[PDB]
């Protein structure tokens, strides 16, 4: 099954931990024009921990995706509710 690497990574997000004025951080603070800055060792250990727990969250969310209501027996689709039919062309709704 296909996992996407486009999920979870922001722009300017990096392991060498630079805060770029237009991406990681809003362009201005109380004072204008923040400069190019680098977080701590531990601030980075934390953001990395955050991305790790993100991936864990997504894996759990993919595994929790198994739930069903059974129609007759197990994998028999007999008696399974298919859900109300589709509204016709005339606006008729059931």
Report the interface residues with RNA, using CB under 7 A: 70, 72-76
13 and 24 in contact (C-beta within 8 Å)? yes
User: In the complex, what is the shortest distance from the CB of residue 41 to RNA, in angstroms, rounded to a whole number?
Assistant: 13
User: In the complex, what is the shortest distance from the CB of residue 74 to Mg ion, in angstroms, rounded to a whole number?
Assistant: 3
Q: Which residue is nearest to Mg ion (CB)?
A: 74
Residue 85 binds Mg ion, judged by CB under 5 A: no
Q: With respect to RNA, which residue has the nearer C-beta, 55 or 70?
A: 70
Under DSSP, the state recorded for 41 is H
Cα–Cα distance for residue pair 53/77, rounded to 1 Å: 37
Q: With respect to RNA, which residue has the nearer C-beta, 2 or 29?
A: 2
28 and 34 in contact (C-beta within 8 Å)? yes
Please give the distance of CA 59 from its chain centroid, rounded to a whole number: 11
Q: Which partner, Mg ion, RNA, none, binds residue 76 by CB below 5 to 8 Å per kind?
A: RNA
Burial class (CB in 10 A: 0-12, 13-18, 19+), 83: exposed
Among 5, 31, 68, 74, the residue binding Mg ion under the rule CB under 5 A is 74
């Amino acid at each position: 099954r296909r996992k996407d690497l486009n999920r979870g990574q922001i722009i300017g997000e990096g392991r060498h931990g630079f805060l770029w004025p237009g991406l990681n951080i809003p362009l201005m603070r109380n004072g204008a024009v923040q400069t190019i800055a680098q977080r701590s060792k531990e601030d980075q250990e934390k953001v990395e921990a955050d991305m790790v727990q993100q991936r864990e969250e997504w894996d759990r969310r993919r595994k929790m995706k198994v739930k069903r209501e059974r129609g007759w027996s197990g994998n028999t689709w007999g008696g399974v509710s298919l859900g109300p039919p589709d509204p016709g062309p005339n606006g008729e709704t059931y």
